Design an enzyme around this catalytic site. Structure first.
Site, mmCIF file in Angstrom:
data_model
loop_
_atom_site.group_PDB
_atom_site.id
_atom_site.type_symbol
_atom_site.label_atom_id
_atom_site.label_comp_id
_atom_site.label_asym_id
_atom_site.label_seq_id
_atom_site.Cartn_x
_atom_site.Cartn_y
_atom_site.Cartn_z
ATOM 1 N N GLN A 11 24.806 -44.187 4.236
ATOM 2 C CA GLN A 11 25.368 -44.529 5.538
ATOM 3 C C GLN A 11 24.495 -44.007 6.672
ATOM 4 O OE1 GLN A 11 29.535 -44.025 5.905
ATOM 5 N NE2 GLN A 11 29.536 -44.869 7.982
ATOM 6 N N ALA A 12 24.046 -42.754 6.567
ATOM 7 C CA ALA A 12 23.192 -42.180 7.600
ATOM 8 C C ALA A 12 21.891 -42.957 7.724
ATOM 9 C CB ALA A 12 22.908 -40.712 7.289
ATOM 10 N N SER A 131 20.157 -38.810 4.057
ATOM 11 C CA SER A 131 20.809 -37.562 4.419
ATOM 12 C C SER A 131 20.914 -36.691 3.179
ATOM 13 C CB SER A 131 22.198 -37.805 5.012
ATOM 14 O OG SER A 131 23.027 -38.497 4.095
ATOM 15 N N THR A 136 24.764 -40.729 -2.135
ATOM 16 C CA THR A 136 23.747 -41.771 -2.213
ATOM 17 C C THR A 136 22.425 -41.272 -1.652
ATOM 18 O OG1 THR A 136 25.455 -43.472 -2.001
ATOM 19 C CG2 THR A 136 23.179 -44.122 -1.585
ATOM 20 N N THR A 170 30.257 -32.348 7.256
ATOM 21 C CA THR A 170 31.434 -33.147 6.945
ATOM 22 C C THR A 170 31.756 -33.186 5.458
ATOM 23 O OG1 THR A 170 30.125 -35.180 6.813
ATOM 24 C CG2 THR A 170 31.019 -34.574 8.962
ATOM 25 N N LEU A 243 -1.033 -42.351 9.806
ATOM 26 C CA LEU A 243 -0.107 -41.606 8.956
ATOM 27 C C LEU A 243 -0.835 -40.627 8.039
ATOM 28 C CD1 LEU A 243 1.950 -43.842 9.938
ATOM 29 C CD2 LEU A 243 2.988 -43.588 7.688
ATOM 30 N N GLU A 245 -3.832 -39.434 8.584
ATOM 31 C CA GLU A 245 -4.334 -38.448 9.534
ATOM 32 C C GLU A 245 -3.250 -37.444 9.897
ATOM 33 O OE1 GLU A 245 -6.142 -40.351 12.803
ATOM 34 O OE2 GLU A 245 -6.666 -38.511 13.876
HETATM 35 N N1 LIG Z 1 -16.471 -38.054 24.553
HETATM 36 C C1 LIG Z 1 -15.555 -38.718 23.818
HETATM 37 N N2 LIG Z 1 -14.857 -38.089 22.918
HETATM 38 C C2 LIG Z 1 -13.988 -38.879 22.271
HETATM 39 C C3 LIG Z 1 -13.768 -40.228 22.450
HETATM 40 N N3 LIG Z 1 -12.798 -40.674 21.597
HETATM 41 C C4 LIG Z 1 -12.441 -39.629 20.919
HETATM 42 N N4 LIG Z 1 -13.136 -38.506 21.290
HETATM 43 C C5 LIG Z 1 -13.011 -37.168 20.761
HETATM 44 O O1 LIG Z 1 -13.552 -37.103 19.486
HETATM 45 C C6 LIG Z 1 -12.627 -36.528 18.570
HETATM 46 C C7 LIG Z 1 -11.952 -37.590 17.732
HETATM 47 O O2 LIG Z 1 -12.886 -38.069 16.815
HETATM 48 P P1 LIG Z 1 -12.829 -39.670 16.419
HETATM 49 O O3 LIG Z 1 -11.647 -40.291 17.128
HETATM 50 O O4 LIG Z 1 -14.179 -40.292 16.633
HETATM 51 C C8 LIG Z 1 -12.439 -39.506 14.660
HETATM 52 P P2 LIG Z 1 -13.025 -40.841 13.538
HETATM 53 O O5 LIG Z 1 -12.421 -42.112 14.093
HETATM 54 O O6 LIG Z 1 -14.525 -40.751 13.450
HETATM 55 O O7 LIG Z 1 -12.295 -40.407 12.177
HETATM 56 P P3 LIG Z 1 -10.731 -40.906 11.701
HETATM 57 O O8 LIG Z 1 -9.959 -40.888 13.023
HETATM 58 O O9 LIG Z 1 -10.256 -39.877 10.689
HETATM 59 O O10 LIG Z 1 -10.972 -42.307 11.165
HETATM 60 C C9 LIG Z 1 -11.642 -35.766 19.443
HETATM 61 O O11 LIG Z 1 -12.177 -34.559 19.917
HETATM 62 C C10 LIG Z 1 -11.549 -36.727 20.622
HETATM 63 O O12 LIG Z 1 -11.095 -36.184 21.818
HETATM 64 C C11 LIG Z 1 -14.527 -40.916 23.430
HETATM 65 O O13 LIG Z 1 -14.490 -42.095 23.747
HETATM 66 N N5 LIG Z 1 -15.413 -40.047 24.073
HETATM 67 N N1 LIG Z 2 22.452 -38.145 12.453
HETATM 68 C C1 LIG Z 2 23.309 -38.904 11.777
HETATM 69 N N2 LIG Z 2 23.834 -38.450 10.587
HETATM 70 C C2 LIG Z 2 24.708 -39.215 9.893
HETATM 71 C C3 LIG Z 2 25.081 -40.460 10.369
HETATM 72 N N3 LIG Z 2 25.950 -40.997 9.489
HETATM 73 C C4 LIG Z 2 26.131 -40.127 8.471
HETATM 74 N N4 LIG Z 2 25.374 -39.013 8.715
HETATM 75 C C5 LIG Z 2 25.255 -37.819 7.861
HETATM 76 O O1 LIG Z 2 25.406 -38.169 6.500
HETATM 77 C C6 LIG Z 2 26.101 -37.151 5.813
HETATM 78 C C7 LIG Z 2 26.902 -37.733 4.655
HETATM 79 O O2 LIG Z 2 26.160 -38.732 3.992
HETATM 80 P P1 LIG Z 2 26.428 -40.280 4.329
HETATM 81 O O3 LIG Z 2 25.183 -40.937 4.868
HETATM 82 O O4 LIG Z 2 27.550 -40.370 5.333
HETATM 83 O O5 LIG Z 2 26.898 -40.956 2.946
HETATM 84 P P2 LIG Z 2 25.851 -41.515 1.861
HETATM 85 O O6 LIG Z 2 24.429 -41.180 2.230
HETATM 86 O O7 LIG Z 2 26.041 -43.003 1.707
HETATM 87 O O8 LIG Z 2 26.258 -40.789 0.487
HETATM 88 P P3 LIG Z 2 27.787 -40.834 -0.004
HETATM 89 O O9 LIG Z 2 28.526 -39.705 0.671
HETATM 90 O O10 LIG Z 2 27.859 -40.660 -1.499
HETATM 91 O O11 LIG Z 2 28.400 -42.152 0.393
HETATM 92 C C8 LIG Z 2 26.990 -36.491 6.850
HETATM 93 O O12 LIG Z 2 27.002 -35.097 6.666
HETATM 94 C C9 LIG Z 2 26.360 -36.829 8.183
HETATM 95 O O13 LIG Z 2 25.811 -35.671 8.763
HETATM 96 C C10 LIG Z 2 24.557 -40.922 11.564
HETATM 97 O O14 LIG Z 2 24.885 -42.026 11.992
HETATM 98 N N5 LIG Z 2 23.669 -40.140 12.268
HETATM 99 MG MG LIG Z 3 28.013 -43.209 1.963
#
Ligand SMILES: Nc1nc2c(ncn2[C@@H]2O[C@H](COP(=O)(O)CP(=O)(O)OP(=O)(O)O)[C@@H](O)[C@H]2O)c(=O)[nH]1
Ligand SMILES: Nc1nc2c(ncn2[C@@H]2O[C@H](COP(=O)(O)OP(=O)(O)OP(=O)(O)O)[C@@H](O)[C@H]2O)c(=O)[nH]1
Ligand SMILES: [Mg+2]
Ligand SMILES: Nc1nc2c(ncn2[C@@H]2O[C@H](COP(=O)(O)CP(=O)(O)OP(=O)(O)O)[C@@H](O)[C@H]2O)c(=O)[nH]1
Ligand SMILES: Nc1nc2c(ncn2[C@@H]2O[C@H](COP(=O)(O)OP(=O)(O)OP(=O)(O)O)[C@@H](O)[C@H]2O)c(=O)[nH]1
Ligand SMILES: [Mg+2]
Ligand SMILES: [Mg+2]
Ligand SMILES: [Mg+2]
Lengths: 430, 427, 46, 427, 430, 46
Positions: A11-12, A131, A136, A170, A243, A245
């Site tokens: 649900q969460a 959660s 679940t 809860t 991601l 990175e």
């Molecule tokens: N003087 C400049 N520094 C830059 C520029 N772009 C990024 N940077 C600097 O360089 C560093 C970032 O390195 P890059 O963005 O070139 C990393 P790269 O793309 O080579 O590797 P991945 O990001 O892991 O693919 C960081 O210190 C930035 O502030 C730029 O246009 N000019």
């Molecule tokens: N931040 C946030 N937390 C939520 C929300 N809805 C449920 N939760 C959290 O989820 C916890 C309980 O798990 P649920 O997601 O409700 O239920 P479930 O994941 O389907 O698992 P079951 O309980 O077996 O059904 C609660 O303690 C809540 O804190 C939401 O909308 N926002």
């Molecule tokens: Mg549930």
């Protein structure tokens, strides 16, 4: 390319995903019916003629929270194989989510994930939402993690979780589910983000001065966090973060992948006018103890590595100035073995504001994800609660009745004990 | 005819090279579409040093644009002058190193390096008298640092008798961008020590400091920094591209600035640099250019030249100038500061004069300085690495793609040896 | 510390050996290349 | 007068021939109706080499159209330039081979082949002095392979002192669209070895590779593949059709490219081939034509020339340009790549240069190469055949029409012998 | 030319023929009364002035289905003497349809086929539609097979059949008829296709989300398959596959001619909007065990030949890409003696949608006919049913009562055992 | 394996014999055939 598949479990997870996809549709101009009247290719797949489907899969063992999507305003955005329902809810049982009910629904969701990832050509990873306390969201999430790990392998696995609050929860069986799911989270996840409900509650109460906030504000704030995560990948900026990175710059050790996501600025409409929001002050507010979205004390821990994800009218000037000022402060102190502990990302796209939301529009926004040792004490009290429940063997019969033993409880407890020792020995000076 | 192959690696290298092509097509009078629209024949007398003739009186740069993600290629192409580049020179992967020197050097960068080698082979064979290569990249990233370092190793294996130029931006403690900067910086400096013929130690901190106090620029984005680096590159290559009263190509600078093969790390500088407010209050003459280029403020590295000894100094002047004036200025610099120049080398300052000034400036100069002040730039990186290396921090990533801690250890052994060499020649 | 530097020297020697082996393997058959002519210098009476 | 009789067998051969007649009629300025509407007199000077003078300033191709399905005949007739053909030359059956070499060579090709010999006879004595024939077919099917192979045997029995070019599309391991490709390919190769003078091993997968990476073509249909094949086999005979500074007919290439009678399987190529985007960023000079020709990636065979030695290569250049540049380029290719060329044949390259280039290109080139790499293109077919033959797979069909296993054994033995010969001369 | 005659025998054959002829009248624009308000010559012969008569014969020993056709919408399509009718049905008895009731109508069906075959000049083959379970569709179809084999000989014979399911089966005496008809189909048929009603129901209920599918949907799917097979004869495309070409490419050994049909995409109207239907995904879906038209797992067997029949907006580029991806997958096994195992046909005509049908309008369509060894186990379970009933001699007296010996049952059993032994022999590696 | 190659040689010999017999049978009467004149070359004093 650069695709990322979102998985929403429980649900969460499903409600947070509904908020996230509402935010994404607002961001990319997609109407709820899936039309656009480019950069949307990260999350939305173009099908046929002007039809975009989100790269998401929604799974819950009960159909209520999914039938809300199937009949809601976003019913035409997804197609029914992205919305999977079971028959019986896990009912706050890790056992039911992992062994009994999870086993006949895992194959179908994995087939859906396979069919979704086949379409993508540059799959960057997975964004899994769950959660800890939910049956679940613990059991089936762990099962899906292990299946993804044995299936996809090197693909990045980013997950967002709702860590139970120290006083507020809860569920009565909450710590059991939390420990049981984290025992497999420790190895089947590449980076796990926790967001505490009490912290969102009091952030809404103080910053957004909402007297009666519901889960809608919870999910909107979490959607803002995830949007700031993926903004460096869905748009362009003077400094981009990917991601992998993100993982490399944030995860120092294989078992330490539990950073704290904090977001700034969160303000109402009326307080935005009186504040001249500069990058320096929002950066300072990110480190402020009451703005952390996990109920812990960063003062009592040491920052290991923090990732700064700026978006909007942000230049490297005041970002570097704010980082230097943070360095000069003695209240915020980093570990000795990380002389440089700031990962920086600037995106030109400002954060969009969803209609009906309580967040006021701001030119600049920050989403700091700080990996700190201050999160060890939250798991310390979680272990205390687990031990209190487990001394009397309470609720254990429920888990045992459908295919689990005491050995798994003992091994999960000792795995968390080893994790606590790991944080203790990485937070120590050399 | 003494042509140069330009290579860009990573986002920073790609953007700096793009601004370099901007400024050098402005200098040579090439429009964004690639057709000559200059006024002087001197703009086409030596156009082949950077541009290849295409059918239809169209000019394409001899540039290879390399990255591990298509985003930087798309940004370069969609920008101004992005249409001038040849499409097949856009050699790009699909993942990105993710700030991983290992992923850029061994696992995924090495998969893509074959195409880059093929394209640079095309560029080197198509041209008649190649002299060297230019690579622009970072040192704190994984794509730029690691993959460009692999590229330099391959090029030196294939072209051992051609010079190697590398305009490298190095991490600095103030503007610290990532968390794994020291790992990549050390692993890249390691192979840059023996693979590059001469390296320019640029950093973002000194460029920001220039933009603050010298340029009085309130909000300098990365474009201004890339413009400064582009101006430095153009001033270095102007002797090849344009005539002068005393010519000095890159080999002359290499033989006059590298007394020993491992000491080829330079602090670049450009003069004049002005604010808009103070433009009309300054005389434009050789003495004030000389005082600006020798200012510890005008350096483009986090290195104070007063803390070290200048081994050799190159001042590539551009404009209509007296030679007595420049020579007397060099005497005044070397005599009023006899304690700041190394003593076993008389004539520490080399002079090159080009008669074609940059666009919009009647007189300009470029400062290149081989100094012992690079030692602390290397020492800060070394101590940051050491702080991260006793505790075995972030090594699980790099070890994941197939290195070992022994590679890191020999990297810091090499860097410490370089630091000791600079210190012992400082005396 | 002497053992560490001895192992370092051994590692460097092994890396140099494998690099030289790869270079020897590559040098047996060069890669296909094509360019311009580079005409030979004319011979003069001397 | 140095006449060529064109024969098309199978759907692939018929479509490739349709595009060939498209490009040929474009070069000589023949409209869809069949009348001359060109501008240059050279178009009509050697118009006889492919056409026949009809009544009323009308030209009809010297083409024979053979198939076992009337559908391909109807499709060819209904297409553009389909009306120029003589309705008599359309020789078609009614059943279809169904990917059976045995059927098209023994059962229903037996009674359809007599009509084809009658038509090719009438065409042979309708001309002044012919030099040979040009058959287009594919090896995967049964109509193409078997029909064209039996036709080749009959022609060589009747015309044994004339050339015989077969632009035969061979199957590929990746692009395999029929299950019995190994059987048909081996059986057809068994007699292509002994009954023809030049065989151009076109394959589909290399054409797809050209369209993917060289042409940057998003969705290449068979039209583009047939366009490539048509351009190459028009450039093969351009010396026959047009004046040039160095002429070379089919027999001259046969002499210079076939050191020993069994080695006449050539790997063709074309240059220039540019994408629309990279059209204006590329100079059109002889060195870059040579670069594209000798690129192993530009080949239209499932072969890597780097995996073997070139015995002989042919460069039938076209356009107004210099013989000095062309011949020094060929010499340079031979010098720096002596490892990739056979050592007991000095001057491995033969050069022909024509004056009139293909329409739209100011100069062009056709590459023909007799390389030892063809051995592995035959090894893949041989091993697929051996896998399918140990278990007698799919053999009840072929044995059903009178064929026996001994013919399969002799075909496999002959192909293995040819592979052994190529390996022997590779050294 | 290139004409093919369709023979429909039994109730299943007649109803599948009704679906097929409705689909073909829609395909070529033929109205139900046989008028156009070329390419139809494959199936329709133009008679007189603007009248088209299908090249079909409808034979059933019972009158009910044939008179349903005679008074239905397509009464004007067929002329009456093509619609052949007996007096009493075979009554689920192979003996009745083969020896007693089938022998008095066999001469009329043979000379009607003769009158229909000499009319066309390029007869390509026969498309016989029947069912294994029924008495008519087994016995009379067998008898017609011997008559066609002794009369027409070398002419091709493609036979469509309905195979009894492991569970879904409406006849008690079904296995007897199934074994007895295969004992003659093994030698008097050139490529006998296989369809199982349970698998078609399963496909309809999961893909076409029909809760309650009838025989008309089943015959609609089967008719789509037959139209896909004959589209090369009836239209033009990049690659054309003839019937003899089909047999040469799909049948490795004379007795192994029982390929598994399948179709893709099979989706509803609401499903097709969101899904992106590319060549790669339908090619993958043809190998999905969930989409097999017969209830059998292809994993337990190994493929020997595949005939990918593409129709619609299909290019050979992504067809080759999809086939390469299929080759890379380790789950789809191929025998070692077939290094190339994909006969490929691309057609330009998109699949027409029947008005009122359950299928959606799609740009592309694939009918994959795979000669796999997975059908050996379905035959084995049918054999187990047969000999389970045979050990007690149940229902045998019904067959013996009208001209059938005891020995034929044993000889058909031995023939099926030899067929299984042959499949096992061709499955093993070398 | 020698038996198989001997049988292959025998099969080749039989096929060649049949082909030669067919060629001899065909060569007795060539097919009726018509073309242009091909005039004889003129003769000159020499
Ligand atoms: N003087 C400049 N520094 C830059 C520029 N772009 C990024 N940077 C600097 O360089 C560093 C970032 O390195 P890059 O963005 O070139 C990393 P790269 O793309 O080579 O590797 P991945 O990001 O892991 O693919 C960081 O210190 C930035 O502030 C730029 O246009 N000019
Ligand atoms: N931040 C946030 N937390 C939520 C929300 N809805 C449920 N939760 C959290 O989820 C916890 C309980 O798990 P649920 O997601 O409700 O239920 P479930 O994941 O389907 O698992 P079951 O309980 O077996 O059904 C609660 O303690 C809540 O804190 C939401 O909308 N926002
Ligand atoms: Mg549930
Ligand atoms: N390069 C091309 N290959 C083609 C073309 N058409 C077909 N083919 C290839 O031809 C091969 C099959 O040969 P054909 O289609 O000519 C079969 P043929 O008519 O000769 O025999 P049957 O049809 O079996 O009687 C197969 O690999 C096809 O991809 C075309 O236009 N271009
Ligand atoms: N798929 C499909 N199968 C059918 C259909 N109609 C009948 N069948 C199958 O046919 C089998 C029985 O044979 P029938 O066709 O009904 O009867 P018959 O062929 O006329 O032979 P008799 O029973 O002797 O009259 C059953 O098991 C059904 O599965 C149909 O419309 N679609
Ligand atoms: Mg990067
Ligand atoms: Mg054909
Ligand atoms: Mg019935």
């Amino acid at each position: 390319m650069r695709e990322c598949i979102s998985i929403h479990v429980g649900q969460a997870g499903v409600q947070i995903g509904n908020a996230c996809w509402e935010l994404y549709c607002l961001e990319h101009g997609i109407q709820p019916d899936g039309q656009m009247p480019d950069s949307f290719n990260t999350f939305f797949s173009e099908t046929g003629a002007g039809k975009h489907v989100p790269r998401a899969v929604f799974v819950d063992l009960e159909p209520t929270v999914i039938d809300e999507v199937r009949t809601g305003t976003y019913r035409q955005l997804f197609h029914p194989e992205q919305l999977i329902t079971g028959k019986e809810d896990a009912a706050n049982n890790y056992a039911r989510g992992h062994y009994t009910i999870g086993k006949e629904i895992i194959d179908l969701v994995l087939d859906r994930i396979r069919k979704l990832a086949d379409q993508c050509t540059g799959l960057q990873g997975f964004l899994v939402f769950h959660s800890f306390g939910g049956g679940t969201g613990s059991g089936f999430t762990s099962l899906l993690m292990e299946r993804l790990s044995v299936d996809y392998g090197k693909k990045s696995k980013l997950e967002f979780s709702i860590y139970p609050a120290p006083q507020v929860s809860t569920a009565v069986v909450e710590p059991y589910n939390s420990i049981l799911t984290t025992h497999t989270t420790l190895e089947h996840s590449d980076c796990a983000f926790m967001v505490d409900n009490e912290a969102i509650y009091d952030i809404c109460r103080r910053n957004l001065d909402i007297e009666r906030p519901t889960y809608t504000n919870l999910n909107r704030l979490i959607s803002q966090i995830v949007s700031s995560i993926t903004a460096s990948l869905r748009f362009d900026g003077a400094l981009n973060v990917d991601l992998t990175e993100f993982q490399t710059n944030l995860v120092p050790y294989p078992r330490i992948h539990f950073p704290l996501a904090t977001y700034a600025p969160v303000i109402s409409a009326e307080k935005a006018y009186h504040e001249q929001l500069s990058v320096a002050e929002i950066t300072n507010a990110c480190f402020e103890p009451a703005n952390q979205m996990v109920k812990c004390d960063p003062r009592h821990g040491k920052y290991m590595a923090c990732c700064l994800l700026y978006r909007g009218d942000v230049v490297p000037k005041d970002v570097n100035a704010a980082i230097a000022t943070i360095k000069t402060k003695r209240s915020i102190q980093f570990v000795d073995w990380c002389p440089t502990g700031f990962k920086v990302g600037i995106n030109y796209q400002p954060p969009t504001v969803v209609p009906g939301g309580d967040l006021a529009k701001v030119q600049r926004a920050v989403c700091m994800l700080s990996n700190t040792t201050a999160i060890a004490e939250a798991w310390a009290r979680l272990d205390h609660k687990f031990d209190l429940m487990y001394a009397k063997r309470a609720f254990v019969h429920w888990y045992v009745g459908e295919g689990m033993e005491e050995g798994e409880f003992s091994e999960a407890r000792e795995d968390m004990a080893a994790l606590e020792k790991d944080y203790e020995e990485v937070g120590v000076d050399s | 005819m003494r042509e140069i192959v330009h290579i860009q690696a990573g986002q920073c290298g790609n953007q700096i090279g793009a601004k370099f092509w901007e400024v050098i097509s402005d200098e040579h009078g090439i429009d964004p579409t690639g057709s000559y629209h200059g006024d002087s024949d001197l703009q086409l007398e030596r156009i082949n040093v950077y541009y290849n003739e295409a059918a239809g009186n169209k000019y394409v740069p001899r540039a290879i644009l390399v990255d591990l993600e298509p985003g930087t290629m798309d940004s370069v192409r969609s920008g101004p002058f992005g249409q001038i580049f040849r499409p097949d020179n856009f050699v790009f992967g699909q993942s990105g190193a993710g700030n991983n020197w290992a992923k850029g050097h061994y696992t995924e960068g090495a998969e893509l390096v074959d195409s880059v080698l093929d394209v640079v082979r095309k560029e080197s064979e198509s041209c008649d008298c190649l002299q060297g290569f230019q690579l622009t990249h970072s040192l704190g990233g994984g794509t730029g640092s690691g993959m460009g370092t692999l590229l330099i190793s391959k090029i030196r294996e294939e072209y051992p008798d051609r010079i190697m130029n590398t305009f490298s931006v190095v991490p600095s403690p103030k503007v610290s961008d990532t968390v794994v900067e020291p790992y990549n910086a050390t692993l890249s400096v390691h192979q840059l020590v023996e693979n590059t013929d001469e390296t320019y130690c640029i950093d973002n901190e000194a460029l920001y400091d220039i933009c603050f106090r010298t340029l009085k620029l309130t909000t300098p984005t990365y474009g201004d920094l890339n413009h400064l680096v582009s101006a430095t590159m153009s001033g270095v290559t102007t002797c090849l591209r344009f005539p002068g009263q005393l010519n000095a190509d890159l080999r002359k600078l290499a033989v006059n600035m590298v007394p020993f093969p491992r000491l080829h790390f330079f602090m670049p500088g450009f003069a004049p640099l002005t604010s808009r407010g103070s433009q009309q209050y300054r005389a434009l003459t050789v003495p004030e250019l000389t005082q600006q280029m020798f200012d510890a403020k005008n350096m483009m590295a986090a290195c104070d030249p007063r803390h070290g000894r200048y081994l050799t100094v190159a001042a590539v002047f551009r404009g209509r100038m007296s030679m007595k004036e420049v020579d007397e200025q060099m005497l005044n610099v070397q005599n009023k500061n006899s304690s700041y120049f190394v003593e076993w080398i008389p004539n520490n300052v080399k002079t090159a004069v080009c008669d074609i000034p940059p666009r919009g400036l009647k007189m300009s100069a470029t400062f290149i300085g081989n100094s012992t002040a690079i030692q602390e730039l290397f020492k800060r990186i070394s101590e940051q690495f050491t702080a991260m290396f006793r505790r075995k921090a972030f090594l699980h990533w790099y070890t994941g793609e197939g290195m070992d801690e022994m590679e890191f250890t020999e990297a810091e052994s090499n860097m410490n040896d370089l630091v000791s060499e600079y210190q012992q020649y400082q005396d | 510390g002497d053992q560490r530097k001895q192992m370092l020297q051994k590692y460097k020697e092994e890396k140099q050996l494998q690099k030289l082996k790869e270079q020897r393997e590559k040098a047996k058959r060069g890669i296909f290349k094509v360019g311009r002519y580079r005409p030979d210098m004319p011979c003069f009476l001397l």
